[PDB]
Design a protein around this nucleic acid. Structure first.
Lengths: 20, 256, 253, 19, 254
DNA sequence: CCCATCGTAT
DNA sequence: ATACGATGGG
């Protein structure tokens, strides 16, 4: 029993924090 | 010529790939003298995973030049699931084939599997990871943390980790109601291995999606301990250490 | 209302037993203890839970509350609780809320969940005093297995109570099937015994669908007591430690 | 266990009990 | 008449799991000598031959030779009821469309008895002959089970290459290619865990992994399996049943 | 470290 | 309606 809950609207990607 | 890496404890290569496969379809392994590295974002470009298996941890390690192998992890998983858990696994590749060989010697010493998988071309992109001080750093049992994320996944879709001096609290809400789990710090009991330790500099109260945490916890078999590391508006770092061989580190951005 | 249960795994077992049969039901809290009584989705069968205050540690009840719980909801919340966890119900008279607090054994983790209560039109039903032509006491497991096995032969089972033992039979497409439980002459299996109080003989017919629901309660008790008379609802009873009981009621042919 | 249906000839518990 | 009392009932249960995914309905051949069964698969690809010798039962009595038409899916569902420690007994009358399976528990307390409807089956029993075999691998049932499962993930056909040194199984597809090499056992204290080869001529045959994987449902009957092969000839996988008989599968190479 | 139970997808 | 993998106990 584990609930796979959708991905929150308010999620930021890690892209906006780390870069090349 | 050639890369060859002989791992006596094969169940690690197997455990690693369970941990990654729910998060990544395809990724570039970075093989080198120093060892095996992997660093990928997830399908949805939400989280980041950094696997590091140092050559010192293998039995045979040989790497003649740097390979960058494009592996389909769905493929590589199904192949590794064939390997017995008590099997001596060996990863082997030539600079002059498009292929990665996984050879499995069973413990009984009379059976030997070997699989050949086709490599792929992956336009990667390697993120820069900055040095970072952390308001909070919980060290707790992998299991405990696993259970919390599972349980609260039933209340709703985000969890609220509040770090304090005394202990950590995790809370979530939704249709059914509200739910609080307060993990106080260990003085002791049995002996390390099953403790809660806090390095609190500044208090923090962060919100995270339970979807991704629950992916990250699929790594729980690699370590009896997990380390969460947190600051205001800075990606959380869930970290599973792999037995004096390396580690596995997930990165997830909190609510802002 | 506050009620501290040392053996938390009971409240967990109870709710697995009920949730296949009842969606929502009214818990009736009082000084005397916790009572519940509901019909199934289909208005075919009836369940009555009775957990006496004697069986709790902290039991306190000021007024008589009638809490409307969604059992599927309350189960999902109780599945969180460790089986070795010290469970406590707390509810504040006013408010549409019931608190389930779970302390783990290390004493270092403590969960607490608040679930939203419902207002329930509880059609209060009145279950008469009855004397019973037959009353088998047998192992919960044995009875569980019989109902599972015969569910494969057919959709109804025929319980024939007799002097020397009980028989269960079913038929259908595949064929026929008879399962004959003789009486234990005491002092064997250790408790794993079959005892009969047969006044008048009976042969009653029941749907195996519902029996198989009732058996979800099997974890609560190593013994089940079946109790019967012509065209009067069969009573399947699982006794809960020294604390209460759980009773199912199903009308025969 | 084989998925069962509820016989047509089933009576409701209403005909046995009441308030 | 026919009555056959089996103390270790878990065998009749194991048998029927092994068969039911391969055969829907089949003709049991009862005789003084014992119980024989022989059917092809729905698909006419493979053949199974069960042989339970009367010596292996406790009570065995069989007046004249009856040919019982049983629905194996039916008889399985009924046998699933039987406890694994239960004393199973088959009884069936001459001119009669029914077979009685009685199950007594160990407690002596509970006793089931089921009646199943038989059917009429014409079946022109094949006749299998003794054949000499280029290769005969004898290995752990488990090992073989695992190989067929693992390679079933690579693709849908396996390539068994017998040689002096050992046997090899290979399969390919989408994912890549996979080779599993069983060398022969040098020591081998125990049968449970040994690999033995009786190589005359080398052979390389191809077989569908679907059917192999069915045949392996028999693995509970024996800690050992025997594969036996020749260049233009059905493979025979054989599980021997403890003091009772055997079960043999026959699959024609692709 | 192997055997027994659960849950979904075709 | 039946197969095949996923989870937990000993």
């Amino acid at each position: 029993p584990v609930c796979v809950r959708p991905t929150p609207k308010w999620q930021k990607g890690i892209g906006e924090f780390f870069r090349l | 010529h050639m890369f060859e890496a002989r791992l006596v404890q094969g169940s690690i290569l197997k455990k690693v790939l369970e941990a990654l496969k729910d998060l990544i379809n395809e990724a570039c392994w970075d093989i080198s003298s120093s060892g095996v590295n992997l660093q990928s974002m997830d399908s949805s470009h939400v989280s980041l995973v950094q696997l590091t298996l140092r050559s010192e941890g293998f039995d045979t390690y040989r790497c003649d030049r740097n390979l960058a192998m494009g592996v389909n992890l769905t493929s590589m998983s199904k192949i590794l699931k064939c390997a017995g858990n008590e099997d001596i696994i060996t990863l082997r590749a030539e600079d002059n084939a498009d292929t990665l060989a996984l050879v499995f010697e069973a413990p009984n010493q009379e059976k030997v599997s070997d699989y050949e998988m086709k490599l792929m071309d992956l336009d990667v992109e390697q993120l820069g990871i900055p040095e970072q001080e952390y308001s909070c750093v919980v060290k707790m049992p992998s299991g405990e943390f696993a259970r919390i994320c599972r349980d609260l996944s039933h209340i709703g879709d985000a969890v609220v980790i509040s770090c304090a001096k005394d202990g950590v609290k995790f809370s979530a809400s939704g249709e059914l109601g509200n739910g609080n789990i307060k993990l106080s710090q260990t003085s002791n009991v049995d002996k390390e291995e099953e403790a809660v330790t806090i390095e609190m500099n500044e208090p923090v109260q962060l919100t995270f999606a339970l979807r991704y945490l629950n992916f990250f916890t699929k790594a729980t078999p690699l370590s009896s301990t997990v380390t969460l590391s947190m600051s205001a508006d800075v990606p959380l770092v869930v970290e599973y250490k792999i037995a004096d061989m390396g580690h596995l580190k997930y990165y997830l951005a909190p609510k802002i």
